Write a structure and sequence with these properties.
Largest sheet of chain A: 7 strands, mixed
Pfam families (chains A, B, C, D): Aldedh
Catalytic activity (chains A, B, C, D): D-glyceraldehyde 3-phosphate + NADP(+) + H2O = (2R)-3-phosphoglycerate + NADPH + 2 H(+)
Bound molecules: NADP nicotinamide-adenine-dinucleotide phosphate
Strand content of chain A: 15-25%
CATH architecture of the largest domain in chain A: 3-Layer(aba) Sandwich
InterPro entries (chains A, B, C, D): Ald_DH/histidinol_DH (IPR016161), Ald_DH_C (IPR016163), Ald_DH_CS_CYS (IPR016160), Ald_DH_N (IPR016162), Aldehyde_DH_dom (IPR015590), ALDH-related_metabolic_enz (IPR051020)
CATH class of the largest domain in chain A: Alpha Beta
EC number (chains A, B, C, D): 1.2.1.9
CATH superfamily of the largest domain in chain A: Aldehyde Dehydrogenase, Chain A, domain 1
Oligomer: homotetramer
Largest interface: B-D, 56 and 57 residues
Structural class of chain A: alpha/beta
Radius of gyration of chain A: 23 Å
Subunit structure (chains A, B, C, D): Homotetramer.
Number of domains of chain A: 2
Shape of chain A: globular
Strand order of the largest sheet of chain A: 14-17-18-13-12-20-21
CATH topology of the largest domain in chain A: Aldehyde Dehydrogenase, Chain A, domain 1
Number of helices of chain A: 15
């Protein structure tokens, strides 16, 4: 078996036990990753903690130089990395190479954003006359050791987005990728190893989350937990963090609200791209259409037609719709599909599953009584919900426990802004599908979708604290 | 004669000579103000300069308290002050009490904005590794003595908007109101006298600009010149400032661009209010309408009708259209009117002048060959210029030497934003008339409309410099 | 008994049950406060949640006006409130009126800071060329309902510091004061009632934390938990918060690091004031002195002498040392004293307790083996720990689980700055005692001393999130 | 003769007439640069104005890529460029290569600082209730065409420091190097040509300032003048700019204030390095020592001794002291030396001139009556002025018409900060010589030393304006 190793204190280490990884589309063995023991996790953390002071003592520009080197290596190796990633998570080849390119971009951008971090000088005389000579010189400091946890759908990009902002600020890292995506995670580690960051500054941890997951999070060496994944795990992490800071990006059931004055063709095009990209396996995917009754029939017909042009098949063929991550997930999606259909929603597409490959399906006239109106599928199934007012759309949208992003399609901008203000989400996109992008923009979820604000500069701010030095001028 | 005095080094001083001021509407004598000599100007400046160190030595909170007190005195005396102001500049009574209230508002806002001025800490390590222990502690400092010069149309407001931002930062002020408005100016000075700011911190200068103007500006005591007035004087101030910092708020020929999808009734209403407020004697007034041909006839008709609803008459009666500030001004407006008429423009309203009271006029079919298409009238005359494309509208708009603000009336917001990027102006108002409005918002002009950025925090920033203290941490 | 009521949805409500409050110094009964039931807590939250949308819909300026009005009432009532406060928490009368004045100040500052909150515009083109016309318009929004919990040592100030930053931003409040201080907290509520903030916008909750404590925190209506108090409770709150945002201000064991070149008289004076203020019942008190051996004897002598000049007695008599909050507390302190003494520490002052009034004690030759070297007493006892190097002082300082603040006394500033960087605390005061002081300055603790950054603007930032609206310019 | 060409609208152009350039140290011909006609200047400007809209239309990221490319070429050719720069301005070889490296750094830093420029969203509701739904979306825009003028002492570095901040923001450039330094300036142009910036975006102008100088500055195509040079020329530019924005970095006579508690060795080392670097031809050089009488003799001795260790000779030999830029300059410097000597100052070094190579001279006991007390020499001559108090030092320091920077040598930092606040300079360095670096730090002069703030981000802000888009949310 092709045995991958964790990167720990500047060395590559195998564990006594291993986890075999297979390609979700083909079933072919891809290799194995170590199933670390708690003692091995202890050594990672002790290694990072010992390296943190010297890493922090370096100048910002030196830390940036290291990150830029990592990003360069990723650019050079985008085809190598994308080829494996594509197979590991059944993501289209081109899309996987793209994920790597975006990872380098984020890493470069963080290096440069974090190198310009500035402090502030506050005046005691702003608050009290007797303190007019007292000033506070406030500078950012790292929180310490960051634990970064990435999800299967972007095992590399959503690791980089946490890692680089943490590192530029002087924090050290322990990176835990998802098990299905742990090889891609270790391929990312290679870049950090080749770049030559000092030993202990960047480290990886592998093993089943269901077995070492609580241990890595509960560990007292961890000063900050930065996680992307399911709402269920994220809730547990919230509790295990206790009073430690956290960044959580979790599930979504993003609504796309369509008013009577919408450009229906632009709406359908965006809805299709956002709903079906990566077979619906995105947190920010359009996951429910709240369309005013009067334009529904026309919009639905455009969606239906565009759904039929989606290619279906294998990762290597760059199909729009690839097989889902695993059996469990495809099973859960099919149950949601059956529930909708059994309850009487109107399927505009054929219901078909072959292995873990579910064919894209559109359900019209979905009601609040159907599971599919609420649950995040993470499969290529889209419900259309007909509404009779914008007030109803807002109510249905906000009734969700999720609040990541929303899309509003209309030609009435000032009104779209007024509706945005009422939507319990992080980001509202006007006349475009929802998306995390562009990476400098804030990325956050309301309610059960998240805690903390991401996007580059916000991640850096999240993973630093402040040191105030106060003195009197003579 | 009721003889007003200047506030100088905490005392009220008369001069050897005086200028009699008369009410523009009734011709009635209002009072007289001193006609200062160059030596008296010298004394104002030497007093201010002497007081500056101790005024800067106060805490921000102490300066803010003085400022809030001034604002409170203004609120208490709004009727007293607005009554005289109304008579001094032929401004509607209610509008004049309104100018005083806005002055108190700007003053209070500036006090609280300026008290929260923060500095920054920069890292040597952001730029070079060898300087990682070097930091720069950067704090704002006043420029010193500010010369504030207000125009006739807002003698009190456009004085407070310069003074309060100047003073909160620790600068000292020498305020020169316009001659026609100097009494109002001196009434404002009373508020500062009663608030009890230390002697020399705030002072006034009176005399004819055409005689002491160059002297007060060229004086080497002055560290900053903040002026609102004609483009003509503004240009001379630019040259006489030499390398000293300046704030110039000059004229405008604000265009109101009307697209085919505009809401015509809203457009007309905003156009009427913006073009005719204070008989068009505002820098930010809507001064030319660039309207798409297809909707022109309809929009023209609406404006015509609303023009007839405008009241005409005296200040005490709160008429919309009051007599112009002076003969010269009315004579200049009549010249533009005749040039447009004699060139073929269609006057939809009756051309009539009685004394200095000119009746509101709407001119249609104004071409680029007419003076009125370009020159700022400072009178109740509106030109309508029909275009056949947005591109044409943009070209014409930008062909002006002025560039204060523009209005865009459309229901296509993203396009409005795209257009706003191309307009050579400081502020673009979408579906609203142009306006200095909301004093916290930036206020600036491109090309011949200004230098520097106003609006509260921007004024504060303009009238402060920075003092950087660099040292190495051990 | 005088039976106080809670302010709930615009009404003053009593509960079935009540808790009787007694003066700690005299034992006299002060009155009673309600002991709310879980259903009454539910009513408070349901009322707040209902009032929130309309409170948010107001303009910043309107919410600020409400806040200023509250602070005005507090200034008017400072003696009435300080009188009771003094009795309820055995705080010197002048100190008590002072806390109320500081509260009004914090409230006004927050109103004015919060009203000026600004959003940002981010460019897609900063990150990717293809997104050059995409922009993000990011504005702050409230989190919703904030649960504010104040401690006994500043029941009113540490309530206002949470309340106003919360309300200015558009959040609603549920304030729970400490039981011993609940009357004072309810007196604060009177001001909010008189100010006339809409019903449900501001509400109080009373009851023993040990009984409704978890219930109020765990309630799903609460969107943010802002707490000051013990580290033990803070930890539990962190766990009960799950993934909801929190602000925790907990214990401290602030060290005062004295170098050989220190100004011993200045040092001694600051050490006395910080250590003994309010009988050592402040989170930020100087709690351990880490003095270089060579200057120890001289410094210790100066402290010893100054301790003897402290007044001991009742609240009404503005004594420096008042009786401790309760018996339990004084018993805890006495156990620390006995442990130090039994272990070999040299008490330079007499050990004496009468009721709950403990006389100020100076322990010299304290070792790391003594409980007093580590545990926060919250009583008038100061240990002196002699070190032989700055490095040692840094080690011992950082060895603590607390990290609120630190003092450094030296004439070598650049070195003091270098030491500050290494100290695991929020704020380092150079040549001054530690202090939350100047409320505009950031206030935070590292390690077990806290979570989140307080200080006005920081609290506002903490209790708001962002809403990003993204669109493409055409 | 090696004929250099100007880079204009993407082409390399010769002029009818040329200027021959000779090496200041050897007298050897170096090459010739064009002597442009007013018409050729007109073509540069028309070219840039035409290229501007399309350069602005690019994304920030694309403009940054071009700049980064330019920086890359400069690094690649640092020896080639430094070799000629060294010869052209008689700057030591390594120092010349060092100037090129610093230019690449500044270009890269500006590229990345500029790409992250963000806008602001202001709320009408902060100022007035009625305007609660109105917001201002404020974004930076370029000013248009920037005229950049560099000085002989850093013909390349002080070109790049103006050019890159201008270009990243979307401005176009016309670069006029100094005549003595025009070759190096054209070498810099080569890197912009090789980077492939579109035609007209970056252009050069060569000719004698005394002949086309006023022309290039008065030209109405120029939207901003960014100049580093003599105070004499800078004053004329101030006037010629009229109301157009400017950045002026002029002369300095930086004082190094030495207190009784100074570390005399560190003080002498810094004084020697700052005063004699590049033979005193630096705006930020230490130009006058204001030393407390009691430590004077000891400091003076240290300086005297360190002055003798300075190498004197040719550029190619990397001598500390090289020949001055020209005869006129060395003649001027000699006159200042003679005045000081004739007036009775104590020369601690021999007075010696061979060609234009003046040996480093230290004059003690300099009195306010000597020209050398006040005039900026731009030669290797240093006056020591003895004082009896810090107040006297401050008075003598501020009595100068220059106020670029100051140095304070002391072991009492809080006092140094109090002294800094009083010094009329832009930057005060504590226990270090004055210097423009690090380049992210602000760089500005008070009084006759400058107008505007430089240092990377400040340069970017100076050369951009704001476009405000106001609208009402529905
Ligand atoms: N388009 C037009 O024909 C027209 C006509 C009238 C007004 N306006 C407009 O009026 C607004 C300001 O009006 P304004 O007539 O009060 O402007 P202004 O005559 O330029 O004067 C504004 C201020 O500058 C002072 N001043 C005059 N000469 C000066 C000098 N040499 N040096 C220093 N200060 C000097 C004035 O004092 P004195 O009052 O003592 O002169 C007054 O306080 C601008 O928008 C301008 O467009 C335009
Ligand atoms: N060094 C010590 O051992 C010691 C002793 C006391 C205080 N302190 C310090 O003083 C500060 C805290 O003062 P404090 O004694 O007032 O502390 P505290 O008991 O933790 O309580 C602070 C606030 O939290 C409330 N609370 C108590 N239990 C709660 C629960 N389960 N859930 C939610 N809220 C709950 C309290 O209400 P109730 O009043 O109803 O309980 C009070 O309002 C910190 O420095 C701590 O270090 C230290
Ligand atoms: N006080 C003194 O007597 C003295 C003497 C030497 C140096 N300095 C110091 O020298 C530094 C500047 O060096 P520098 O000698 O290169 O200064 P400078 O002669 O003022 O020239 C700086 C730049 O200005 C250009 N220039 C000259 N006349 C101009 C005009 N009318 N309009 C526009 N641009 C014009 C120059 O081109 P050309 O090269 O073709 O003219 C040059 O690139 C400052 O620190 C200054 O204080 C002072």
């Amino acid at each position: 078996t092709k045995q991958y190793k964790n990167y720990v204190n500047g060395e590559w280490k195998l564990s006594e036990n291993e986890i075999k990884i297979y390609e979700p589309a083909s079933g072919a063995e891809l290799g194995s990753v170590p199933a670390m023991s708690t003692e091995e996790v202890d050594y990672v953390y002790a290694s990072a903690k010992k390296a943190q002071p010297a890493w922090r003592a370096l100048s910002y520009i030196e830390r940036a130089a290291y990150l830029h080197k990592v990003a360069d290596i990723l650019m050079r190796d985008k085809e190598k990395i994308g080829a494996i990633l594509s197979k590991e998570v059944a993501k289209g080849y081109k899309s996987a190479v793209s994920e790597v390119v975006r990872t380098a971009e984020i890493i470069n951008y963080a290096a440069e954003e974090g190198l310009r971090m500035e402090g502030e000088v506050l005046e005691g005389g702003s608050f009290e006359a007797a303190s007019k000579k007292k000033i506070a010189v406030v500078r950012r400091e790292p929180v310490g050791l960051v634990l970064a946890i990435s999800p299967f759908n972007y095992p590399v990009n959503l690791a980089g987005s946490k890692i680089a902002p943490a590192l530029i600020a002087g924090n050290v890292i322990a990176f835990k990728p998802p098990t299905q995506g742990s090889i891609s995670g270790l391929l990312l580690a290679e870049a950090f190893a080749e770049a030559g960051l000092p030993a202990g500054v960047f480290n990886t941890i592998t093993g089943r989350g269901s077995e070492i997951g609580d241990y890595i999070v509960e560990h007292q060496a961890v000063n900050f937990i930065n996680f992307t994944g399911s709402t269920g795990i994220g809730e547990r992490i919230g509790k295990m963090a206790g009073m430690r800071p956290i960044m959580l990006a979790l599930g979504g059931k993003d609504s796309a609200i369509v008013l009577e004055d919408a450009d229906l063709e632009l709406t359908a095009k965006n809805i299709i791209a956002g709903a079906f990209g990566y077979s619906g396996q995105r947190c920010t995917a359009v996951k429910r259409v709240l369309v005013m009754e009067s334009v529904a029939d026309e919009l639905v017909e455009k969606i239906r037609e565009k759904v039929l042009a989606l290619t279906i098949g294998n990762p290597e063929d760059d199909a729009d719709i690839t097989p889902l991550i695993d059996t469990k997930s495809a099973d859960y999606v099919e149950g949601l599909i059956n529930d909708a259909n059994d309850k009487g929603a109107t399927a505009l597409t054929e219901i078909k599953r072959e292995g873990n490959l579910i064919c894209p399906i559109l359900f019209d006239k979905v009601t609040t009584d159907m599971r599919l109106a609420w649950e995040e599928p993470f499969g290529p199934v889209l419900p259309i919900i007909r509404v009779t007012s914008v007030e109803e759309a807002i109510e249905i949208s906000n009734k969700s426990e999720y609040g990541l992003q929303a899309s509003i399609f209309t030609n009435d901008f000032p009104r779209a802004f007024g509706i945005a203000e009422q939507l319990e989400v992080g980001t509202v996109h006007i006349n475009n599908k929802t998306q995390r992008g562009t990476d400098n923009f804030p990325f956050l979820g309301a309610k059960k979708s998240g805690a903390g604000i991401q996007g580059v500069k916000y991640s850096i701010e999240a993973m630093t604290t402040v040191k105030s030095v106060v003195f009197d001028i003579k």
